[PDB]
């Protein structure tokens, strides 16, 4: 719900300059419409997905140990907090899952390259900031 902290850690995880990755960025079709009120089940799914995304072996390969840990533990509390309040539209939750496969597909295509990873890091930042 409050992605400030996450956004900061993300901006700091950068290793390459996007200004060197001029032929890598991709529009992933973020389903922005599902966040304009925004159902919590789907906030949850967003954070949930981001968490699956960055706790892989490939992730741990790409990012700094310290930063990534702070980042992941934040997602970890966000999740727990979110999860309380989800006591109680599978259409939205689905669009979020799809979007995130478009992302891993991407990463696979690009052989998990540093430039590809920057694209993605930033892509998450965008989605985070657009989810509030």
């Amino acid at each position, epitope marked *: 719900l409050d992605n400030r902290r996450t956004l900061m850690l993300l901006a700091q995880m950068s290793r390459i*300059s*996007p*200004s*060197s*990755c*001029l*032929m*890598d*960025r*991709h*529009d992933f079709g973020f389903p*922005q419409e599902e966040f304009d009120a925004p159902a919590i089940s789907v906030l949850h799914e967003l954070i949930q997905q981001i968490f699956n995304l960055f706790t892989t072996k490939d992730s741990s390969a790409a990012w700094d140990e310290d930063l990534l840990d702070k980042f992941c533990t934040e997602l970890y509390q966000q999740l727990n907090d979110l999860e309380a309040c989800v006591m109680q539209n599978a259409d939205s939750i689905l669009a979020v899952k799809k979007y995130f496969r478009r992302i891993t597909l991407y990463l696979t295509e690009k052989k998990y390259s540093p430039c590809a990873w*920057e*694209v993605v890091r*930033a892509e998450i930042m*965008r989605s985070l900031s657009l989810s509030t």
Partner: single-chain antibody
Amino acid sequence: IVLTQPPSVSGAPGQRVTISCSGSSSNIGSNYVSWYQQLPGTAPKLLIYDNNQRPSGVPDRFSGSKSGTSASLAITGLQSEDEADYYCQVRDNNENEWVFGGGTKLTVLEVQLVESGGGLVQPGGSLRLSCAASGFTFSSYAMSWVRQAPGKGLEWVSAISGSGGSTYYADSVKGRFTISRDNSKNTLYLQMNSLRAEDTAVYYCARYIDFGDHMDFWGQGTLVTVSS
């Protein structure tokens, strides 16, 4: 190669009007779209980026949209000051090139870039363009050159990474032009060789934000004319 908009559109004040951008999916389908506005005489200014995002000072009657393989700029509460040319822009994953639409003439009822070196030359001649940059950390931004021929719309020419290790060119100028950079002196260059009469145009340098999906800032341009 191409990315089409309606050559002209008009509306009355207070009206709402729409400007279409229709592309392939090697570009629009794949990539984030930006829009640029160009008042008569002025350099283009960024108007919409990442499909629907709006820069700082831009009124909110301006909105962007993307739908599979086409973009759309929408203006509401139309006003006489919106009279300008409007350009969509996007990267094309096939050609490894940026590209502008043919533009649309809308008829209504601290950072600095300074290009130099322009001038007048014989076909087959040579010129070197400089762009003096200031008000930001230059190394950290990719740059581009973009030209507008007499009476025509925007055409992307060349681009170069923050470091300098990556360069990109439009077919038009491939191998004749060479984009350079000296980050110790905050200058972008463009060596133009074997000049042609079609190279005639105002040359803008422009600063790429991040992954080069859009450029937020433009110089005022230097005029380059090629005549026998």
